[PDB]
Design a protein around this ligand. Structure first.
Ligand SMILES: *C/C=C(C)/C=C/C=C(C)/C=C/C1=C(C)CCCC1(C)C
Ligand SMILES: *C/C=C(C)/C=C/C=C(C)/C=C/C1=C(C)CCCC1(C)C
Ligand SMILES: CCCCCCCCO[C@@H]1O[C@H](CO)[C@@H](O)[C@H](O)[C@H]1O
Ligand SMILES: CCCCCCCCO[C@@H]1O[C@H](CO)[C@@H](O)[C@H](O)[C@H]1O
Lengths: 220, 53, 53, 220
């Protein structure tokens, strides 16, 4: 039922990708980047799910099953989500560089740990967990302050997307620890189903919330 | 209805694993699928709650 | 926190049954405890949701 | 772990009983009946849970375990809850007689069905299910209209307690069908745990909501 779950993830990401592309067809010169980023976020995820649905990238590591495309997906898409949040917050190059750096450590850490048999994987997890707390600090602190300098509508959207992000992203590390990568209490099937749900919400749900605010922002 | 429907879908998938495992006759295999189902449902609640919030 | 704590308490109780059943070695006994746990957790969601509403 | 669960139910009901008795110590001549009813609702339930915690009233019927005190409890306490709701709604004798009659059919039906081996138990369940729909009709219709003739505070409390009642009571029949009385998909332990939770909310939770509104009603 794994392939079936991966196909559902692919379909969900595809629907989102198309909706975002269509919704941004007539976007102004200032909204453009936002729509394009959303397309890239869900588009790359759709590819990762298709690759896994086709049975590619499955890695039977020390009596467990980890999926390489899942982590590759994250390494490339989460920084785009952070970029989107950063654009709303109005960050400069330096500030973007800081959060992208932190985000990348998180994703590379989970990927490396997932491929590492033995207790060493937990040290790698720790590296990612600490970087993640640092990322959360920037999102709720400095970046929120930066967002406060924008319009009420922008600040409002930033906050909604940031909350969704902080709260749901915080769940992934528990699934990593409880799933195949860690103590393997969750079966590959349950692990994949929970991630499909979380991925769809953090990418497609995230996008629809932005699309829903578009008209209000233009009116401002 | 959304969270409710999804929780039902998840339970069904979880049930599928338990049933499949039971077919083998290995009590340990069933236990593994069951613990997974229980922890999965609890996490699902976390997700749903986080989403609502 | 309330619903969350209770869901955890319920899962623990459910887990206790699965574990106890597994100790017997009967795959069918484990399956029964598991289906019960899954359906119970789903009902618990119904209760919690109804309460909130 | 059954006895442990029954003791928790007893303790929970006892705490509620004492809280309601204490809260009504200085109740006026017009609030008195309300506090007394709450005491009776949770007090009788506390006795039923103690009896079951002591291993009394357990009935091993055709490969399943049903608990006589549970049903006896319901037959005597649910009509007191309906009475409380009826008092807020301002019902007359006739109207009270109608809802109490319907309520009693529901409880007697579930009790009889629980003690009846074979498909006949489902006909008994049906009798209770239909009576319950009739009860729900009176609660949301005629009695709500009656409650609308009272103060805004009374109507407000009636509605809150009625919603809690209609929504949660509707769950019991599913637990009956899925639990030991019906198809027995829920184990006795899970069945008892869910009922302890529902009983505490429909009686003690119900009471604390009323206690919380007391001061506001007096101010009116
Ligand atoms: C599109 C998919 C998303 C939003 C994925 C988010 C993934 C995370 C927030 C993962 C976090 C992890 C940690 C904090 C610790 C190390 C292990 C990870 C990679 C599971
Ligand atoms: C204090 C305990 C309470 C509020 C118990 C409420 C019980 C019910 C609403 C039971 C309803 C049933 C049906 C509608 C159909 C037949 C079986 C029952 C008795 C489980
Ligand atoms: C569907 C997603 C719609 C996102 C709309 C985001 C609107 C943010 O607002 C835009 O931010 C830009 C930042 O450089 C500014 O240059 C634009 O003038 C401003 O309108
Ligand atoms: C803790 C529960 C407090 C319940 C307070 C209910 C107050 C309802 O209000 C009371 O209803 C009576 C009905 O006969 C009237 O006679 C009283 O004058 C009126 O104050």
């Amino acid at each position: 039922g794994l392939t079936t779950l991966f196909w559902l993830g692919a379909i969900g990401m595809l629907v989102g990708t198309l909706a975002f592309a269509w919704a941004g067809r007539d976007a102004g010169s200032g909204e453009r980047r936002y729509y394009v980023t959303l397309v890239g976020i869900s588009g790359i995820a759709a590819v990762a799910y298709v690759v896994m649905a086709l049975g590619v990238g499955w890695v039977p590591v020390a009596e467990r099953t980890v999926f390489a495309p899942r982590y590759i997906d994250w390494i490339l898409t989460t920084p785009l989500i952070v970029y989107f949040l950063g654009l709303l917050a109005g960050l400069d190059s330096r500030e973007f560089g800081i959060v992208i750096t932190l985000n990348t450590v998180v994703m590379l850490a989970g990927f490396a740990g997932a491929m590492v048999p033995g207790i060493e994987r937990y040290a790698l997890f720790g590296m990612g967990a600490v970087a993640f707390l640092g990322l959360v600090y920037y999102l709720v602190g400095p970046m929120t302050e930066s967002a406060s300098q924008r319009s009420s509508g922008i600040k409002s959207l930033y906050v909604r997307l940031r909350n969704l992000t902080v709260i749901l992203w915080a769940i992934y590390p528990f699934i990593w620890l409880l799933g195949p990568p860690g103590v393997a209490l969750l079966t590959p099937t349950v692990d994949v189903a929970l991630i499909v749900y979380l991925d769809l919400v953090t990418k497609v749900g995230f996008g629809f919330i932005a699309l829903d605010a578009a008209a209000t922002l233009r009116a401002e | 209805i959304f969270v409710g429907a999804l929780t039902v879908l998840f339970g069904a998938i979880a049930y599928g694993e338990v049933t499949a495992a039971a077919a083998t006759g290995d009590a340990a295999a069933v236990q593994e699928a069951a613990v997974s189902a229980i922890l999965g449902l609890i996490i699902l609640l976390g997700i749903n709650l986080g989403l609502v919030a």
